Design an enzyme around this catalytic site. Structure first.
Site, short mmCIF file in Angstrom:
data_model
loop_
_atom_site.label_atom_id
_atom_site.label_comp_id
_atom_site.label_asym_id
_atom_site.label_seq_id
_atom_site.Cartn_x
_atom_site.Cartn_y
_atom_site.Cartn_z
N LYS A 104 -26.07 -69.97 63.78
CA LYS A 104 -26.00 -69.65 62.35
C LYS A 104 -25.05 -70.53 61.55
O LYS A 104 -25.44 -71.14 60.54
CB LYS A 104 -25.66 -68.17 62.19
CG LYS A 104 -26.55 -67.25 63.03
CD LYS A 104 -26.59 -65.81 62.52
CE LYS A 104 -25.19 -65.25 62.32
NZ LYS A 104 -24.33 -65.61 63.48
N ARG A 133 -24.41 -57.08 58.72
CA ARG A 133 -24.30 -56.89 60.16
C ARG A 133 -24.46 -55.42 60.53
O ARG A 133 -24.12 -55.03 61.65
CB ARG A 133 -22.93 -57.34 60.66
CG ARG A 133 -22.81 -58.78 61.05
CD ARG A 133 -21.38 -59.00 61.48
NE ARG A 133 -21.21 -60.00 62.51
CZ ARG A 133 -21.01 -61.30 62.30
NH1 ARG A 133 -20.95 -61.78 61.07
NH2 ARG A 133 -20.86 -62.10 63.33
N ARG A 175 -16.66 -74.41 71.82
CA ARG A 175 -16.73 -74.47 70.38
C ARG A 175 -15.40 -74.82 69.77
O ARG A 175 -14.38 -74.16 70.00
CB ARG A 175 -17.20 -73.15 69.78
CG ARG A 175 -16.98 -73.11 68.27
CD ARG A 175 -17.75 -72.01 67.56
NE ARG A 175 -17.29 -70.66 67.88
CZ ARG A 175 -17.77 -69.56 67.31
NH1 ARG A 175 -18.72 -69.65 66.39
NH2 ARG A 175 -17.29 -68.37 67.66
N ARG A 191 -11.26 -70.74 67.93
CA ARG A 191 -11.01 -69.39 67.43
C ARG A 191 -10.34 -68.44 68.43
O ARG A 191 -10.67 -68.43 69.62
CB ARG A 191 -12.31 -68.78 66.90
CG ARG A 191 -12.74 -69.39 65.55
CD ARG A 191 -14.21 -69.13 65.24
NE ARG A 191 -14.56 -67.72 65.34
CZ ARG A 191 -15.76 -67.22 65.05
NH1 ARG A 191 -16.73 -68.02 64.62
NH2 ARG A 191 -15.99 -65.93 65.19
N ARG A 244 -17.94 -58.79 71.62
CA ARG A 244 -18.66 -59.18 70.41
C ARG A 244 -20.18 -59.11 70.54
O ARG A 244 -20.86 -58.57 69.67
CB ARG A 244 -18.21 -60.58 69.97
CG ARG A 244 -16.81 -60.63 69.32
CD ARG A 244 -16.35 -62.05 69.05
NE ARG A 244 -17.37 -62.82 68.36
CZ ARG A 244 -17.49 -64.14 68.43
NH1 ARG A 244 -16.64 -64.84 69.16
NH2 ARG A 244 -18.49 -64.74 67.80
N1 LIG Z 1 -28.86 -75.61 68.62
C1 LIG Z 1 -27.67 -75.62 69.31
N2 LIG Z 1 -27.59 -76.09 70.58
C2 LIG Z 1 -26.44 -76.09 71.26
N3 LIG Z 1 -25.32 -75.63 70.71
C3 LIG Z 1 -25.30 -75.14 69.46
C4 LIG Z 1 -26.49 -75.12 68.70
N4 LIG Z 1 -26.21 -74.59 67.49
C5 LIG Z 1 -24.95 -74.29 67.46
N5 LIG Z 1 -24.35 -74.61 68.65
C6 LIG Z 1 -22.94 -74.39 69.01
O1 LIG Z 1 -22.75 -72.94 69.09
C7 LIG Z 1 -21.42 -72.61 68.72
C8 LIG Z 1 -21.49 -71.31 67.86
O2 LIG Z 1 -21.05 -71.48 66.48
P1 LIG Z 1 -22.33 -71.32 65.50
O3 LIG Z 1 -23.50 -70.88 66.27
O4 LIG Z 1 -22.67 -72.75 64.87
O5 LIG Z 1 -21.98 -70.28 64.28
P2 LIG Z 1 -22.38 -68.72 64.64
O6 LIG Z 1 -23.96 -68.59 64.95
O7 LIG Z 1 -22.05 -67.84 63.49
O8 LIG Z 1 -21.56 -68.25 65.95
P3 LIG Z 1 -20.41 -67.17 65.59
O9 LIG Z 1 -19.52 -67.05 66.76
O10 LIG Z 1 -19.54 -67.68 64.32
O11 LIG Z 1 -21.08 -65.73 65.31
P4 LIG Z 1 -19.95 -64.65 64.88
O12 LIG Z 1 -20.34 -63.21 65.47
O13 LIG Z 1 -18.63 -65.01 65.43
O14 LIG Z 1 -19.93 -64.60 63.23
P5 LIG Z 1 -18.42 -64.46 62.66
O15 LIG Z 1 -17.80 -65.80 62.59
O16 LIG Z 1 -18.48 -63.83 61.20
O17 LIG Z 1 -17.59 -63.49 63.62
C9 LIG Z 1 -16.23 -63.49 63.19
C10 LIG Z 1 -15.79 -62.07 62.87
O18 LIG Z 1 -16.16 -61.74 61.53
C11 LIG Z 1 -16.34 -60.30 61.45
N6 LIG Z 1 -17.43 -60.00 60.49
C12 LIG Z 1 -18.17 -60.92 59.79
N7 LIG Z 1 -19.06 -60.32 59.05
C13 LIG Z 1 -18.96 -59.00 59.22
C14 LIG Z 1 -19.63 -57.89 58.69
N8 LIG Z 1 -20.65 -58.07 57.79
N9 LIG Z 1 -19.26 -56.65 59.08
C15 LIG Z 1 -18.27 -56.47 59.96
N10 LIG Z 1 -17.60 -57.49 60.48
C16 LIG Z 1 -17.91 -58.76 60.14
C17 LIG Z 1 -16.80 -59.87 62.87
O19 LIG Z 1 -16.14 -58.67 63.28
C18 LIG Z 1 -16.48 -61.04 63.80
O20 LIG Z 1 -15.61 -60.67 64.87
C19 LIG Z 1 -20.82 -73.81 67.97
O21 LIG Z 1 -19.68 -74.31 68.69
C20 LIG Z 1 -21.95 -74.87 67.92
O22 LIG Z 1 -21.46 -76.18 68.23
MG LIG Z 2 -20.77 -68.57 62.19
#
Ligand SMILES: Nc1ncnc2c1ncn2[C@@H]1O[C@H](COP(=O)(O)OP(=O)(O)OP(=O)(O)OP(=O)(O)OP(=O)(O)OC[C@H]2O[C@@H](n3cnc4c(N)ncnc43)[C@H](O)[C@@H]2O)[C@@H](O)[C@H]1O
Ligand SMILES: [Mg+2]
Ligand SMILES: *CC(=O)NCc1ccc2ccc3cccc4ccc1c2c34
Ligand SMILES: *CC(=O)NCc1ccc2ccc3cccc4ccc1c2c34
Length: 214
Positions: free
Chosen positions: A13, A88, A123, A156, A167
């Site tokens: 994402k 979410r 990452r 992170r 998570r």
């Molecule tokens: N095609 C491919 N092939 C190979 N490799 C690839 C690839 N594409 C990507 N990659 C690699 O994959 C890795 C993943 O990063 P990447 O996939 O690029 O971003 P991502 O899909 O969002 O992964 P996240 O870990 O950021 O999901 P998340 O649950 O942590 O979302 P959030 O940050 O808000 O989580 C943070 C915190 O925010 C809080 N939060 C956010 N929003 C809410 C909400 N609405 N309600 C409650 N809590 C919330 C949560 O509690 C959470 O703990 C990267 O290193 C990339 O290089």
């Molecule tokens: Mg993200």
């Protein structure tokens, strides 16, 4: 254009949002990124979110709902926006409807939790931009350094193997339900819904989106 990226941690994402943002000139709204730097300042609108986020648990709906309502308001969201990480939860989803905010697409990022953990380890991110990389799958032209700003990259606190586990489980339990939610919303013409294979290289995925977006 108003789009929703639905998918589990490390699903791609964040990465795919970059391409889309510039590809369609819409602001990338990422609750997680926004929360990361809201505590990185202290601001209560953050701070008391570091512990939840690091433990792998979810922030309260209220908070992100308010956070997004404010963000969407800005004059750069008048032509659409990209929701990455929000909603979410059903309550966050319903919160949007009561808000009357209809969404064009809700993209489902399909990825086996099996990749997730091997994926979030390497990452390396660049906090400020949200920009992210992988020490193997998607590395920056220079090690430990951002491609755009050349600023050093970080990792992170929550990318800790065990927290990643929590998570994911959290995802399947609280968020995963939205797959069904927005499906119904789809079978009711309230939004175009579409799945994507997140296990392809970034570029391949970037193709699929293009294909589905224009
Ligand atoms: N095609 C491919 N092939 C190979 N490799 C690839 C690839 N594409 C990507 N990659 C690699 O994959 C890795 C993943 O990063 P990447 O996939 O690029 O971003 P991502 O899909 O969002 O992964 P996240 O870990 O950021 O999901 P998340 O649950 O942590 O979302 P959030 O940050 O808000 O989580 C943070 C915190 O925010 C809080 N939060 C956010 N929003 C809410 C909400 N609405 N309600 C409650 N809590 C919330 C949560 O509690 C959470 O703990 C990267 O290193 C990339 O290089
Ligand atoms: Mg993200
Ligand atoms: C700091 C923290 O995460 N506390 C809450 C918590 C404690 C122990 C667990 C053990 C196993 C688990 C499996 C999936 C999700 C999850 C979420 C919070 C947990 C926790 C979890
Ligand atoms: C899939 C998922 O997120 N499960 C929720 C969950 C599972 C096991 C736990 C064990 C011990 C715990 C202690 C405090 C809070 C908490 C919250 C969710 C848990 C969990 C927890």
């Amino acid at each position: 254009m108003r789009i929703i990226l639905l998918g589990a941690p490390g699903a791609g994402k964040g990465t795919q949002a970059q391409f889309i943002m510039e590809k369609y000139g819409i602001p990338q709204i990422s609750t997680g990124d926004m929360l990361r730097a809201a505590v990185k300042s202290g601001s209560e609108l953050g701070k008391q979110a570091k512990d939840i986020m690091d433990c792998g648990k979810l922030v309260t709906d209220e908070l992100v709902i308010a956070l997004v309502k404010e963000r969407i308001a800005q004059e750069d969201s008048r032509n659409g926006f990209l929701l990455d990480g929000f909603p979410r939860t059903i309550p966050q989803a319903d919160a949007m409807k009561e808000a009357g905010i209809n969404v064009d697409y809700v993209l489902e990022f399909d990825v086996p939790d099996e990749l997730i953990v091997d994926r979030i380890v390497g990452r390396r991110v660049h906090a400020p931009s949200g920009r992210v990389y992988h020490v193997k799958f998607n590395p920056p032209k220079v090690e430990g350094k951002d491609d755009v700003t050349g600023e050093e990259l970080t990792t992170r606190k929550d990318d800790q193997e065990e927290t990643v586990r929590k998570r994911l489980c959290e995802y399947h339990q609280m968020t995963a339900p939205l797959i069904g939610y927005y499906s119904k919303e789809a079978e009711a013409g309230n939004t175009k819904y579409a799945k994507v294979d997140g296990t392809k290289p970034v570029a391949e995925v970037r193709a699929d989106l293009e294909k589905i977006l224009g």
